[PDB]
Amino acid sequence: RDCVHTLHSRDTWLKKARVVRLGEVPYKMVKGFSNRARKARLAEPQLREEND
DNA sequence: AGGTAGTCACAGCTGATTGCGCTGAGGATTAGACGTGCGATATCTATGCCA
Numbered sequence: 001r002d003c004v005h006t007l008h009s010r011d012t013w014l015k016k017a018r019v020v021r022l023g024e025v026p027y028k029m030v031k032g033f034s035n036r037a038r039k040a041r042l043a044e045p046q047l048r049e050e051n052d
Numbered sequence: 053a054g055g056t057a058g059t060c061a062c063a064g065c066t067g068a069t070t071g072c073g074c075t076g077a078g079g080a081t082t083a084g085a086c087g088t089g090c091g092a093t094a095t096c097t098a099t100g101c102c103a
Contacts, residue, residue: 033083 026052 007028010020029052033041041048 031084
């Protein structure tokens with residue numbers, strides 16, 4: 001479990017008063033969902049998985 | 053006594069006025085999780101088959 005870690009978006013990290021370091025690799029590329037993003041993904045499902 | 057400049061009484065030009073339109077700030081406003089229900093599915097052992 002100590003090797004299992006929780007993650008947040010860069011915007012959510014900033015909300016948590018955290019700034020991602022330069023060049024940091026994405027620990028998890030996952031589904032992205034925001035108002036404009038959600039509507040765009042509903043427009044076409046091919047990029048719903050491709051957002052990451 | 054004589055005529056055109058100073059003074060007063062009216063005219064054109066233009067700015068302020070009064071209906072009415074438009075932006076900028078300001079205060080109102082179901083998607084992964086978490087489970088289970090159902091269904092396909094590994095799973096353990098009785099016990100009598102005949103060599």
